[PDB]
Write a protein that binds this ligand. Structure first.
Ligand SMILES: CC(=O)N[C@@H]1[C@@H](O)[C@H](O[C@@H]2O[C@H](CO)[C@H](O)[C@H](O[C@]3(C(=O)O)C[C@H](O)[C@@H](NC(C)=O)[C@H]([C@H](O)[C@H](O)CO)O3)[C@H]2O)[C@@H](CO)O[C@H]1O
Ligand SMILES: *[C@@H]1O[C@H](CO)[C@@H](O)[C@H](O)[C@H]1NC(C)=O
Ligand SMILES: *[C@@H]1O[C@H](CO)[C@@H](O)[C@H](O)[C@H]1NC(C)=O
Ligand SMILES: *[C@@H]1O[C@H](CO)[C@@H](O)[C@H](O)[C@H]1NC(C)=O
Lengths: 173, 325, 172, 325, 173, 330
């Protein structure tokens, strides 16, 4: 990754998660699954779309080459026309080939950063109530309800609520 | 215990993009921005069919070569297809002056209306009927001439008298007309067709002046002709007037086109079928919504930008790293 | 936001922090206030400024159109000129408009990055002396004097000094 | 209950917006607008030098010496030229200024011309040099006049037109811009009345130049009641170059020429006022007084100007995303 | 720096670490020294090298000026050839100059992200077993032989193994 | 003491800087210089084919066959042309070579030329070949001479200049570059003396070309002690085409012509005073040889061969390393 989440410390993707780009996977006594984060997937869709549309719009300007003929005394103005038309050709072929190599890089980075920020938005909520396993995955020191899993996602996690349950469990081992 | 994880999307996509840092990167969603596909035919643009000049070249069509009579009336085109191997052009050997400027000017137009600018009766005391060449056969007649010009010759009476004509463009549209100057190989041919003594051709408008006299010599046989004709074109602006005046060697304007004014002229093999187009290139139709194309820089209508790129694939999805079964 | 901080976990901004781009809001028994971080602000200003001048300087050369005249035997080159002049017009209009669009995207992220690394700088200092709320705000497990606040900003925060006082209330 | 220090960022009463590849209409706390879209609709001095107002005169009218262009006559120096669109005084005696466009370009820059008598009428022995006027070219005072830079040379009352000759060896520093002509009559009667009989020629040479032209008598459509024509010519006698003239008749002689001194130069065809103001940027449609990098006013300018682009706005964010409470 | 690692929270570079762009410094009872993180410098070397080659490739095309003589009745198209040729000369000069400025800003950020992601990798392993000094330095609350140092560098560090040992040593201070 | 593990980065003794959009003069550990400003001030063989050094002749002096250009006489082959800025021997008899810029462009883009006799002096009957010499055109040996590729045809003791005709047919495979002229005396005296009295003409034609010109008699400023002028002309007789020459007088006749092979490559003409040596090259700029691996150059926009893209830039240094913050020793 460059942010390091994608193809990085979070080793892989979820074919099982099919309703968004970025998401949560949970497991608890009531079940397990894969739930996409709608807000950070929407905001990335609006944004990538706008990028695509911005480039499309900027690129809707054509250079029109011409069919004109030239006599045996017009070699110089004829070659002047050829270099002109090949010049604007090389300039626009560059302008697109390079922009695509660049914008792809920055697009992959953009995703990598939205995974990373989702990972940090949870880690600053669980603190020591949860244990950090590998691959951006967390094991709670307490029992997490579905309505617990829900609060972690929508940002209304109740840390105090599970503080004493966690402590007793965390170093019982 | 209970687990909550954070992660990202994957799918069976095997489509790869490229990057400044990395090549061959598989991603989950992407958009191709370039069209490499092309109907190899010519179509109507703006619902206005092209003009197929068939076996005739642009010089042949518009000068009025006798073997191009198929093209003879008025014409409305959205572009012109000129088949490369067309063999009917300038039949009586000689140069059409400012050729390229005229192909350019004809290209700008969308319509021409043929009309008789200078009736044969405009020239008194001379022979309109006699002049035709074996170098300019029609399909039916071995000897004929351009339907837009009159090879005027002197009558049986020896003298060729000063002949004069005018045409006033009271019209709203410009007039493309042609004329020329015969250049016999001999002094013997000069005297047979035209009077004795120095001959001249002269023409003038408010904004023009022309003047030429025959250059007499044998050029190599072309179409069995060792003589030549200098051809000329010009455009009578609306409100302008043409005065013609010669005592010999004039190949006169007969018929001219009222001319209506981006357009193109395609040299091409491709067929013209009963089909519509919104973008036509010199190598095919582009029925596409893509932003770029690598098909051809030469088109007419609404087309995508032309680049030499084989692919221009943007990425819109994250790197595709699915679980390995 | 890309680095998560601006219009992210720090939801809004402070119409009250007047002296800087990036800053601290504190609360105390002595009161609450706003205070910019000069180092990161003035280094950001320096950068943004140099970007603007790098752009302006690169864009210094013009393309000179001429409006020469052409005759009626000069339709080809007169058109060659027009395609040519609108050619460079179409390129430089793209270059500008695209650069501006890209650089605007990247500049907004720079400010996001700089606000994030401010939050990380404070977080690293405090450690377990303070509790990290969701919003880039920290609740102290002790009493923090205007001198204490000042030290967090200065980057000279004495962690052991308040450690024992903090261990108590953290568990009390 | 605990004391808190927060980290956050600036906000302000801003409503100014920008676009990014990822989002449109993003309000931002501090931005810079790089594009200038305002102008003073007028013409001002450049480098503290005033522009040349041809006024009622076209460029042709000015440097040939049209009788009605007398207020422009003499020395001129300019920072740029302003030719008005409906200027009526140009070529008064009908005919074609050959290489008109190329002459317009050479004149175009150009910063100053000093007018001097190149060939005095004393040259041309045995021909009348005082009867060459015409009703086509009136001054404001007189019905029949002629261009101040040329002499219309006509046969002495007692015939004929003899070989006339002149020369000029350029010892100065600066190139000399000069003009001449050949008369083309509508009859052989005008031709005879004004010049000798016989075959007439006009021949001009320099070390790097060759001219030769003879009359082409014919009747062109009436322009200013004239069915005769004059072909005008221009040239540039480089420093150290000698000019030899020799004619037989039909020569419109060079009387006055310009010492010509030559940066980037403009000819603005416009109707905008020239006011008593100064400027650093002049545009064909207005003044630009600005520090901005881009302008959307015009591609045609003189001075130090912003670069021209088609953009309505070019605004760079300097501050940050504005989210106030 | 933008990720804050290079010339940021980590103040300086190591003239001592000669085998890599990013690395670890360790001090042991057994010894001290410098060792480059091998996985990461190779991914940075690949990535940057492709960036350089992508640029070089995209710039493969050349506009061609030609020296064609022009006569004194050919001022207009003489200047048409000049304004065209300079026009492309100014377009390519701007591309190569703005791109170098841009890519240079971005390649510094990439290096500065690899340092920050290296440090975040280690910091998430150590948890409270290690004390945090400044400059991206950790002091272990336990012993750490070479084998233990290696395990941190290799991403295979054992937190329970030393959790007890670290906790007591921490209590004492 | 307690066990430490630090995360950090490389530094080195490099003093090499780059600029970025945010910061100028940044020192970095590793970087590549992308632009080349070094050059060899000389001209080198390019496809193992040596250029053509016109030396003290101009382009016109060379193909008209000026006497003093005899060193260049005959067949020639080349990968580009070097013409010296102050070469004296060009058009020795004053007058215009017409469509010159277009001839120089045509000559460039031509890999080689074979010289041959297109029209032999016998071609013209009734006229004097052997008087056609001037002393505005000396050779190095004879004070009065004339171009090697043209005949100045003058008249014989009989007062009349007879009509003369010549035909050349291009049987095969190569364009032929050839020249001819029309003489313009300062006098009718000289006109009558050199050629027959009465109206005169030069007429020439091919399947695709027509030429007619008549003398323009006038006194012109002395150049090379000559007040007369010659109009010189050039043309290219395509394969399978035929030229007819016919003249009443004043014809400077084609004598020798060039079989012309055009090139598949970039043709070029360098007006330089740099030298030519026994060396090879892949890039030749007008101001020197580039021998480089880099992607850009600031040396010249004019070249033949494979070259870096030209830009005005002084330097183009891409960072490949990181910010270099080495430790402060004292
Ligand atoms: C006004 C004045 O005094 N000037 C001319 C004077 O220049 C000219 O004399 C010419 O003088 C030059 C150099 O002084 C040569 O001597 C000319 O002689 C030759 C020549 O070598 O060029 C001799 C040669 O044999 C001739 N060749 C042929 C084939 O004719 C040529 C040729 O005739 C001329 O070039 C034709 O223009 O000239 C000598 O002419 C005289 C001659 O009219 O006139 C003075 O007025
Ligand atoms: C040129 O040569 C060919 C081949 O011999 C011949 O057929 C042709 O007639 C020639 N052209 C002329 C006009 O002599
Ligand atoms: C470094 O700074 C100097 C002036 O201090 C400047 O001339 C140069 O362009 C800068 N960049 C490099 C490459 O050193
Ligand atoms: C032109 O004038 C200069 C200076 O007076 C002189 O040297 C040269 O001989 C003159 N040439 C002619 C043809 O008069």
């Amino acid at each position: 990754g460059i942010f390091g989440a994608i193809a990085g410390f979070i080793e892989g993707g979820w074919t099982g998660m099919i309703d968004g780009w970025y998401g949560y996977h949970h497991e608890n006594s009531q079940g397990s699954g894969y739930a996409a984060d709608r807000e950070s997937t929407q905001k990335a869709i609006d944004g990538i779309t706008n990028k695509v549309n911005s480039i499309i719009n900027k690129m809707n300007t054509q250079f029109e080459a011409v069919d004109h003929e030239f006599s045996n005394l017009e070699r110089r103005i004829g070659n002047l026309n050829k270099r002109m038309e090949d010049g604007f050709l090389d300039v626009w072929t560059y302008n697109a080939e390079l922009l695509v190599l660049l914008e792809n890089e920055r697009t992959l980075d953009l995703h990598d950063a939205n995974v990373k920020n989702l990972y940090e938005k949870v880690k600053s909520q669980l603190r020591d109530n949860a244990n950090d396993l590998g691959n951006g995955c967390f094991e709670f020191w307490h029992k997490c309800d579905n309505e617990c899993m829900e609060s972690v996602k929508n940002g209304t996690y109740d840390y105090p609520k599970y503080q004493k349950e966690s402590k007793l469990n965390r170093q019982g081992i | 215990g209970d687990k909550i994880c954070i992660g990202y999307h994957a799918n069976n996509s095997t489509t790869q993009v490229d990057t400044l840092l990395e090549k061959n990167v598989t991603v989950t969603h992407s958009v191709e921005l370039l069209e490499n596909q092309k109907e190899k035919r010519f179509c109507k643009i703006m619902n206005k069919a092209p003009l197929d000049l068939k076996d005739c070249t642009i010089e042949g069509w518009i000068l009025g070569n006798p073997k191009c009579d198929l093209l003879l009336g008025d014409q409305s085109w959205s572009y012109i297809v000129e088949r490369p191997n067309a063999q009917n052009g300038i039949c009586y050997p000689g140069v059409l002056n400012e050729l390229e400027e005229l192909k350019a000017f004809i290209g700008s137009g969308e319509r021409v209306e043929r009309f008789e600018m200078f009736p044969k009766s405009t020239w008194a005391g001379v022979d309109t009927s006699r002049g035709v060449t074996n170098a300019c056969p029609s399909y039916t007649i071995d000897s004929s001439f351009y339907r837009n010009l009159v090879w005027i010759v002197k009558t049986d009476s020896a003298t060729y008298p000063v002949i004069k004509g005018t045409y006033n463009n009271t019209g709203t549209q410009p007039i493309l007309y042609f004329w020329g100057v015969h250049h016999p190989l001999d002094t013997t041919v000069q005297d047979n067709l035209y009077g004795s003594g120095d001959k001249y051709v002269r023409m003038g408008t408010e904004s023009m002046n022309f003047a030429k006299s025959p250059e007499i010599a044998a050029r190599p046989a072309v179409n069995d002709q060792r003589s030549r004709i200098d051809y000329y074109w010009s455009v009578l602006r609306p409100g302008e007037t043409l005065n013609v005046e010669s005592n010999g060697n004039l190949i006169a304007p007969w018929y001219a086109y009222k001319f209506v004014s981006k357009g193109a002229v395609f040299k091409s093999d491709l067929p013209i079928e009963n089909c519509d187009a919104t973008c036509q290139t010199i190598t095919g139709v582009l029925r596409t919504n893509k932003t770029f194309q690598n098909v051809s820089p030469l088109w007419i209508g609404e087309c995508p930008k032309y680049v030499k790129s084989e692919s221009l694939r943007l990425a819109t999805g994250l790197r595709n790293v699915p679980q390995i079964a």
